[PDB]
Symmetry: C2
């Protein structure tokens, strides 16, 4: 149990890096979890320089070479009312709060150098904003969650979840605002970057595949974009992770199939370490991306050698605790094949104690990408099954959109199918479920709707009640709940696990940050009252002065430690 | 920290023993917290023999030599609805449930070998029961908490908390039942044992001094008992822990002053290890008692040598973590002197992080006795301050009875004076409050009524709302609440920290077993609601399938570990 603490601490503590851009002339801007919190750094080639003072949540996308960084930081103890802080790169550790922007949920943003352009959610709206030397301007109100993708000249390009789980492309004008929304009937836009010719290149993810298209923002004309090299189209990607024009005009694309990605410059394969990659930057005539895998914490590497620029290293005992990984295709209730990553623990027998670790989102995926939760479970003697239930990204629009209107429906059947597969295939001697956010909702749904499937469940930062949550949500989250539930009152009630507590037969652990503004604490307290009144076994841990986005080691530990303890305790019986 | 977990674990894991009597001819009957849980053992000079199968809570007091033991086990996952199980001492590990006794809160009991006589509380009454060969009989209904002390022949003697915090003597007849209650106007009876002459020898605790009396149960006449040796009366005890007749007719008395006890046989002092002692038994012609101190976990020893028969060795590193202890007399608001035990941690500076650790009860005391919580605090690098606030035992009837009608009044002032004493004496560089049960009530009362006094508070198994708790309480606890509060609804409301949440300014850690039936979880969930709605910082840890009485190592870890983590975190800032 003290060994579990050491394992969880060191898994959280290992340095994790994400590539944000190039700044300060010719230096990497990198967001790193290092020295126990999320900070932003310049990487010159040798020593990193820390840009921020206190922990941050993120940084805005910098235009190449801009001489500043815009930090995004929660100023509300985890409720995700962020403020923006400017740091001049020549003077690291000196912060200027951008006081023209009232705290709000910052969803995204780019800094051109002249203007800081972002989307943000308040109680009454999601909006696209620009802050220049003249002051703050609302460029447009957006229908739902929206994200700035790119800016070139006065053209802004972004992606919008504006209905039915579909992603629209949007543009606006930096100088005079407005909104133009481009919707594909074939699928969803997944990344965007403005070409030198002032067209929007976008990934378009259709039924079971992904391709690149050009959108002219003047008329709504969409063509297929063909590249000089044909490696990209032959790769037959299912998803586009990211794309962007480099300063030399070449289009870089990270695309993926089956939970691993590949890098392309102007269509041509650039070799990269196995796993997943993030944005690709040009830096000192070398391609640089982020790399991660189930065995590799996020790190910065140079392509095509794959040599690390910035990486944290795991202790050898923790590396060994992960025996192997594999993708399997689990047949579900309608014969659909649920792509399921399996992390085999080198610290459990086969069959052995097995956790179905259910991903959040739901528009997210279990890929060959580092997962601290999964790693801590493998360290603690559990195999880990991570099913890409319908709703997941990475496997086509059709699979992703199947969740719409059907929470605690087919996706739960997929999660249950992976569970039964883990037993039937001989992997699991016993079964647990665990999840954070939409994953925690799945824990609650599994224990309420599928009693006896799992031995016990962990529900972290859970959706508990669509109805009460709606009442407490900001404009983005209200809209997203509308989308997920299809605007159906019956769905919001019947698919809320708080309404099926009497069905629970298994021990449940609840973990919840008190200031969560995504999945609020209030319905969780009501759930505890229901568990109590109905004589159900439950454990609960409420984390102080924290919300949904964990950005310190001590909060990461508070969230994960009790989950690992609980399951380890359950394994004694 | 993993080092904290390890120390906490090792402190919990150390075996702790209580002496219950002599059975199976001439074998000691002990209850040991051992091998991870509370169990019953025979000891006859070598290895213990485990009598129970699953963990228990206690055993009933056996008459010398009886060939069986009656286990008391919680059969409601911590809610303290107990069933009785008999184990024939010749056939250890084979239990037979006494099915005539439906689950109830068993408060006490004696087993003559032919009749099991006990007190228990259901929802509607507290009663004295006898189970013999002809079945179960209710001998009498008691006004409130009552405990059987002794049976000789047909006579039963007990102690009753039957009004005003005062303890009465009561008798009954095993054959015919009934109830006779004897009050003293000078004080409270603390201990009782029937003499050969069929009168009741009792400890009478008065204003300051305690003495031995003889109560004739036929007419209620009381006279002082003078013993052959005068070491006892000249010791001038303030409290009488225990007394009992030995097989040879000698009267064993354990009495105490200033948190330390002494043992007497027919009034003659018997040398014993410094600290506190429990019952004294004759085993193979010689004297045996339990012993505990601040630096020695409860153990069974021979007198007068002090040689251990059953002892969980305190490892040297943990022992060394307590650099010292002191008894101080804190000046309270009204000139009262609050006897306060202090532990200096060998792992903190002076001045240094200090926890006022508040005792439960309130009719209990901090004495020179083992305290796992205090030890873990010392191990974690905190000085510990343990004030015997008014309401405490050990310092006379007047001091103990001051709390009556005044919860969250003078006693909280004593606690606050102890905080002030810690700072002003130079011990404390910073101050926290921590407590379980009435102690947790004090945490909550301190953060609501004395904001800014402590840096942070830990409230375990707390009283939260007198009124709601009363309505959820069984007959015993309803009566006790009436006595403690005076029955006034204004006291019940005004002295409930849930009605003062607005004033809270310090971080608060709530810890609570889910099935607690003394201090129920329900009002604590409401408190969390209020903390949430009023934007207060808090954490909470609810522990599964557990109640107020902790009987496993892992449950004690779930109760204690969050507290130490919380305080350690608080000390970083």
């Amino acid at each position: 149990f003290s060994r579990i603490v050491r394992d969880v601490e060191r898994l959280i503590a290992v340095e994790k890096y994400s590539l944000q851009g190039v700044v300060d002339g010719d230096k990497l801007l990198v967001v790193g979890f290092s020295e126990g919190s999320v900070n932003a750094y310049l990487y010159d080639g040798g020593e990193t320089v820390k840009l921020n003072r206190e922990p941050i949540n993120s940084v805005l996308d910098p235009h190449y070479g801009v001489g500043r960084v815009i930090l995004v930081r929660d100023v509300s103890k985890g409720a995700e009312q962020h403020a923006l802080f400017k740091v001049n790169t020549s003077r690291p550790g000196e912060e200027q709060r951008l006081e023209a922007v009232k705290p709000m949920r910052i969803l995204s943003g780019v800094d051109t150098g002249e203007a800081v352009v972002f989307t943000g959610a308040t109680e009454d709206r999601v909006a696209l904003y620009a802050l220049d030397g003249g002051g703050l301007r609302e460029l447009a109100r957006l229908p739902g969650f929206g994200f700035v993708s790119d800016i070139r000249g006065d053209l802004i390009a972004g992606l919008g979840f504006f209905g039915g789980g579909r992603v629209s492309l949007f543009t606006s004008n930096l100088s005079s605002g407005g909104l133009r929304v481009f919707d594909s009937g074939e699928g969803s836009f997944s990344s965007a970057s403005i070409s030198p010719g002032m067209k929007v290149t976008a990934g378009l993810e259709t039924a079971r595949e992904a391709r690149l298209v050009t959108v002219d923002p003047r008329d709504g004309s969409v063509e297929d974009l063909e590249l000089p090299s044909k490696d990209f189209s032959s790769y037959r990607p299912t998803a586009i992770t990211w794309l962007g024009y480099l300063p030399d005009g070449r289009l870089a694309v990270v695309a993926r199939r089956e939970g691993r990605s590949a890098v392309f410059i102007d269509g041509e394969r650039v070799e990269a370490p196995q796993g997943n990659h993030g944005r690709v930057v040009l830096w000192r005539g070398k391609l640089v991306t982020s790399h991660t895998s189930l065995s590799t914490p996020p790190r910065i590497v140079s392509l095509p050698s794959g040599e690390p620029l910035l990486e944290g290293g795991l202790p050898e005992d923790l590396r060994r605790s992960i025996a192997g990984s594999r993708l399997v295709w689990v047949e579900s209730f309608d014969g659909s094949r649920v792509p399921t990553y399996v992390l085999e623990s080198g610290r459990a027998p086969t069959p052995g104690p097995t956790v179905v670790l259910v991903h959040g989102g739901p528009f997210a995926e279990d890929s060959d990408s580092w997962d601290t939760f999964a790693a801590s479970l493998a360290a603690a003697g559990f195999h880990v099954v991570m099913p890409n239930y319908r709703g997941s990204t990475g496997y086509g629009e059709e699979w992703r959109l199947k969740i719409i209107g059907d929470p605690c429906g087919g996706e739960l059947e997929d999660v249950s199918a992976a569970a039964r597969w883990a037993r039937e295939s001989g992997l699991a001697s016993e079964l647990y479920i665990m999840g954070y956010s939409y994953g925690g909702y799945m824990t609650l749904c599994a224990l309420t709707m599928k009693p006896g499937l799992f031995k016990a469940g962990v529900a972290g930062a859970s959706v508990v009640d669509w109805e009460e949550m709606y009442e407490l949500s900001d404009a983005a989250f209200r809209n997203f709940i509308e989308q997920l539930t299809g605007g159906s009152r019956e769905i919001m009630r019947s698919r809320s696990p708080i309404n099926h507590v009497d069905r629970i037969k298994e021990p449940l652990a609840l973990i919840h940050p008190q200031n969560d503004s995504r999945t609020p604490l209030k319905p969780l307290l009501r759930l505890m009252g229901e568990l109590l009144a109905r004589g159900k076994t439950f454990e609960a841990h409420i984390i102080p002065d924290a919300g949904h986005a964990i950005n310190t080691m001590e909060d990461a530990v508070k969230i994960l430690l009790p989950a690992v303890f609980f399951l380890a305790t359950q394994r004694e019986r």
